[PDB]
Amino acid sequence: MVKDKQKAIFSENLNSYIAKSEKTQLEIAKSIGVSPQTFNTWCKGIAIPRMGKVQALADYFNINKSDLIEDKKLNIDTVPIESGYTLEHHHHHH
Secondary structure, three states, rough: OOOOHHHHHHHHHHHHHHOOOOHHHHHHHHHOOOOHHHHHHHHOOOOOOHHHHHHHHHHHHOOOOOHHHHOOOOOOOOOOOOOOOOOOOOOOOO
């Protein structure tokens, strides 16, 4: 195919949030401040918007930009951080 994996991840993640909403792509596009054709290419993973729009997307969904950039490999694994941040543990014998 010769396709960039990052754009495939970004769209995959973004599309997840979009398809979880009942507002159309044309709806979200106006709220962000873009044209439907611009939003269409994002949803198809053809292009990634600039920081000003990526932040706008995350800001509108009340999420982190990191949620759109990093892969949905959401398997919690203890993350030592130099602060008083909350972390959870599972523990299952398998």
